[PDB]
């Protein structure tokens, strides 16, 4: 006979979802500004329409997205292998190979074959092909059902070939699906270790060894992925709010007057711009107003030089004597003004040059000759008991604000500073006024040293540990606490600061007014430095590098306070114990989670329906009744549902039965299916308007065998509601097979196919003594036994034949002794073919590939390579018919036992 598939079909295998991921450059010479590039591409094997999208990028034209271009690829005859995404290992499924015939008026006769694959259990074996001939009417299609059972996990391949009779047309499809184990995805937490190198670990580093994934529910030989999550833990510190700029609108003053009156109007404007620039409240205050006040600051510096005496000193008039306080206060205001506006620096350093030559006794004391006409600007220095020590600290602070600007100009400045600092330490422990200890508390903390006792007296003189207070006008005390805040911010102390700033804010002092020169300048210079240097966070900076033996490199991550990489995940498919080294400052969290396949109940099939499918030979060659009963598992009746019925090979439904079912009230069989021919009708859909949840809705129709076939593939029935194909239920039906399942032998979620031949079919008369020795002496033949059948444990899945090892003719890899028992397994389809009788003796040999269980409970399988021959008893050999066989068996034993197998 002719196998039409001899056409040497190379099946189509390239079915990418996307391709042509290419990069081309239009280098061809342009014609009217348009370059045309011709490009040869090789279309893939898919029979579909491709959408080609092109995007161009040009130096002079930019980005352009072309309109999509479509290419349709088709044939007149082809296979569409409708393969599911995944299939559970050892679960029986029915795939669909749809064959299309788009000939206009030609009815095709096709020979279609499912190719054998050892990874699957089907009707196709190594010695038998699953070929069948089908008929496809023109402009129609036919679905060819194939029943398979995947036997090994991973990407497995299904190939279907087809060739048409009387035309030189052929096609083949070779797609692949994923075989997933019977478990369910599950995630477990491996470790949660908090990283803190300055609290854990030693010498500044923290080593954390992570144990590998501790799974004990994992399906054997399945992949696991371990996800390493390094994540920094951000922390924040409380800070006191800045003063609302709406309360500071009155500090913008046009400076006027003489040498002392000009500085009174210049002070609130310079300190307001300075405080608003640091806090950046100009958006909520008026961005336009910033330039106007900036000109008033220039107006103040311009009119103050009119009263700068030629001796680089400052007085109220050009004929007035110079002041030690007023000169030191112009240095204090001009120094803080340099950051926003500048004109001349020799004016600032010229006043510091005069402030040391004339008003610096080598004792370090600054003494005031007092030509200050305005006692308003003096502040707390006025009406001070220790007016001598409070003034030495005032001028010393003025020199420091100008020290970084006049270091090269005034080279004798560090000498007077050291001398002024020497005078303060001596009489610091003798002061009794809170103002003197506060201004001289910021005067010795600034780039200086306050002794332990001096710091203790500075902190203990704060009444209620938050404020500096003394009998006198409150503007002296507000000025004092402002000096004490600049000291706590110069010493970088932040445990005494919060209650100090809170008191300054609760004072609700917004500057301005009479005699407010010092109080307005200091309260906003201190509160600006608090906003300039403040702990908002705790300085996170972790250098965490993980050394994994899974790779040859160490991945590191600098977890700054920067928000670019707060968390960074590192996946590692290898499940191995790795080391986490973490050093630096701050805190962090490490999370290690491993996903895996946990073995559990395989119960995901038929979770929404009950489905009972029975096939009965109830009484043109053969005629059976296919009965289908289904029931929805919900609290209410299900909506419109589908019965996807598949015929067993060689059978077609009775047309008159379908027309009576289509006339049902809650059923619908489409007119398309009723008008179909009797033959080439192996699939059918019965639509249900509803399926009850309380009772089983049953329908039944007869099926006739219009074509006799040697092997009948089990039919299938599939139920699902229209809105969810995933929630389906499939039952197989087949006469002479248990529940429609193909013959397979399973043990501990490992199955092997049993559709092969029952045993070696060679006849007992066509075999000779030399043929037995040549077969049995092959290395593949592991065991050769003489057995005695003791018991036959009949079961519906497979028959178990308990054999007593009468003689060990050739011992194999299984150490079995004479008298022991071994179980020989064979599917029930071979029960009539083997014809085994109890208490009879048999000669048996087979392959080591037919072993089944573990060594303590080792079972034998009777496969296509297992020799099973009847051994007649000693008295039975007296017959002339058994004389030939007994002479062979008796000689076969003596030749194997006494002399073994050469080579």
């Amino acid at each position, epitope marked *: 006979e002719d196998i039409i598939a*001899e*056409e*040497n079909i190379v099946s189509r295998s390239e079915f990418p979802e996307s391709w042509l991921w290419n990069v081309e450059d239009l280098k061809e010479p342009p014609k009217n500004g348009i370059s045309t590039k011709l490009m040869n591409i090789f279309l893939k094997d898919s029979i579909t329409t491709w959408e080609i999208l092109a995007v161009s990028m040009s130096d002079k034209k930019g980005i352009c997205v072309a309109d999509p271009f479509e290419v349709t690829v088709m044939q007149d005859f082809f296979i569409d292998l409708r393969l599911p995404y995944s299939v559970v290992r050892n679960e029986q499924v029915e795939i669909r190979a749809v064959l299309y015939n788009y000939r206009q008026n*030609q009815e095709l006769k096709v020979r279609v074959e499912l190719l054998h694959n050892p990874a699957f259990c089907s009707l196709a074996t190594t010695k038998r092909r699953h070929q069948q001939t089908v008929t496809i009417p023109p402009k129609s299609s036919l679905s060819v059902p194939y029943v398979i059972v995947p036997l090994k996990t991973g990407l497995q391949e299904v190939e279907v070939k087809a060739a048409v009779y009387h035309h*030189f*047309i*052929s096609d083949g499809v070779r797609k692949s699906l994923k075989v997933v184990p019977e478990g369910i995805r599950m995630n477990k937490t491996v470790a949660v270790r908090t990283l803190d190198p300055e609290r854990l670990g030693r010498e500044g580093v923290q080593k954390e060894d992570i144990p590998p994934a501790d799974l004990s529910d994992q399906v054997p030989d399945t992949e696991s992925e371990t996800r390493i999550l390094l994540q920094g833990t951000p922390v924040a510190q409380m800070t006191e709010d800045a003063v609302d700029a709406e309360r500071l609108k009155h500090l913008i003053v046009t400076p006027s007057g003489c040498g002392e009156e000009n500085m009174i109007g210049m002070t609130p404007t310079v300190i307001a711009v300075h405080y608003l620039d640091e806090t950046e409240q100009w958006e909520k205050f008026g961005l336009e107003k910033r330039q106007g006040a900036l000109e008033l600051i220039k107006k103040g510096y311009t009119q103050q030089l009119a009263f700068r005496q030629p001796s680089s000193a400052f007085a109220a008039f050009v004929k007035r004597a110079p002041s030690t306080w007023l000169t030191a206060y112009v240095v204090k205001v001009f120094s803080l003004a340099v950051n926003l506006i500048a004109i001349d620096s020799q004016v600032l350093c010229g006043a510091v040059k005069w402030l040391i030559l004339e008003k610096q006794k080598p004792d370090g004391v600054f003494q005031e000759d007092a030509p200050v006409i305005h006692q308003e600007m003096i502040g707390g220095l006025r009406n001070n008991n220790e007016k001598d020590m409070a003034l030495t600290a005032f001028v010393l602070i003025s020199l420091q604000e100008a020290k970084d600007i006049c270091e090269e100009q005034v080279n004798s400045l560090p000498g007077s500073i050291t001398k002024a600092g020497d005078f303060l330490e001596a009489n610091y422990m003798n002061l009794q006024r809170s103002y003197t200890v506060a201004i001289a508390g910021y005067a010795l903390a600034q780039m200086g040293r306050l002794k332990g006792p001096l710091l203790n007296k500075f902190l203990t003189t704060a009444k209620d540990k938050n404020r500096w207070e003394d009998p006198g006008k409150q503007l002296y005390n507000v000025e004092a606490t402002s000096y004490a805040l600049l000291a706590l911010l110069q010493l970088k102390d932040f445990d005494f600061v919060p209650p100090v700033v809170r008191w300054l804010n609760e004072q609700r002092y917004y500057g301005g007014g009479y005699g407010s020169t010092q109080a307005t300048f200091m309260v906003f210079q201190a509160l600006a430095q608090y906003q300039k240097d403040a702990p908002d966070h705790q300085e996170l900076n972790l250098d965490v590098s993980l050394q994994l033996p899974s790779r040859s490199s160490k991945i590191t991550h600098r977890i700054h306070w920067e928000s670019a990489s707060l968390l960074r995940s590192e996946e590692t498919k290898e499940n191995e114990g790795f080391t986490v080294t973490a050093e630096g400052k701050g805190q962090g969290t490490l999370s290690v989670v491993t996903m895996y396949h946990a073995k559990a109940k395989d119960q995901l099939t038929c979770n929404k329906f009950d489905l009972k499918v029975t096939i009965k030979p109830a009484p043109n060659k053969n005629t059976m009744i296919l009965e289908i009963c289904t029931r929805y598992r919900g609290d209410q009746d299900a909506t419109m549902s589908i019965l996807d019925i598949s015929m067993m090979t060689g059978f077609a439904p009775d047309t008159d039965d379908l027309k009576q079912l289509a006339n049902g009230v809650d059923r619908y069989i489409s007119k398309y299916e009723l008008d179909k021919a009797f033959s080439d009708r192996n699939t059918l859909i019965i639509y249900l308007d509803k399926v009850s949840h309380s009772e089983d809705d049953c329908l039944a129709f007869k099926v006739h065998q219009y074509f006799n076939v040697e092997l009948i593939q089990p039919g299938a029935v599939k139920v699902y509601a229209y809105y969810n194909l995933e929630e389906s239920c499939t039952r197989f039906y087949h006469p002479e097979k248990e529940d429609g399942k193909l013959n397979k032998l399973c043990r501990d979620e490992l199955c092997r196919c049993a559709e092969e031949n029952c045993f070696i079919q060679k006849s007992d008369d066509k075999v000779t003594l030399e043929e037995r020795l040549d077969k049995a002496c092959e290395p593949g033949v592991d065991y050769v036994y003489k057995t005695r059948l003791v018991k036959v444990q009949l079961s519906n899945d497979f028959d178990e034949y308990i054999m007593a090892i009468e003689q060990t003719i050739k011992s194999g890899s299984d150490e079995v002794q004479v008298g022991q028992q071994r179980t020989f397994i064979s599917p029930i389809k071979c029960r009539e073919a083997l014809k085994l009788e109890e208490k009879k003796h048999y000669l048996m040999w087979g392959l080591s590939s037919d072993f089944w269980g573990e060594k303590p409970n080792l079972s034998y399988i009777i496969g296509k390579d297992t020799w099973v021959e009847h051994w007649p008893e000693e008295d039975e050999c007296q017959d002339e018919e058994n004389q030939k066989q007994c002479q062979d068996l008796g000689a076969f034993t003596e030749s194997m036992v006494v002399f073994g197998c050469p080579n």
Partner: nanobody
Amino acid sequence: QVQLVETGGGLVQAGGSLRLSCAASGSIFSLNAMGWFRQAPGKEREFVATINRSGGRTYYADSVKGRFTISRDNGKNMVYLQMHSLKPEDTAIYYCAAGTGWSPQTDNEYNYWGQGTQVTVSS
């Protein structure tokens, strides 16, 4: 497209033999049907032989059923027609044609034909 050139013809005696070689323009691979056709003087163009794409299937006309043998070489872009045991009724112009594979025994599925060659078998 593709065109064909027929060679190997000529004059022969009644009993002898000769093979005709068909040369293809482009790659003959992926072309399912390659057929030979002949037209005798005073008669219509009739079917002779077709060959499969891989060469594993052929079809012959009943008149030349067991006397001709069609073969192809997909690597050389060549088709051949070995003619044995000639008869005086085989005198015709022999045409080489490219087909689609559908109905390979009819000329209605051949869109690319050749010049043809004269094979005169004299009595």
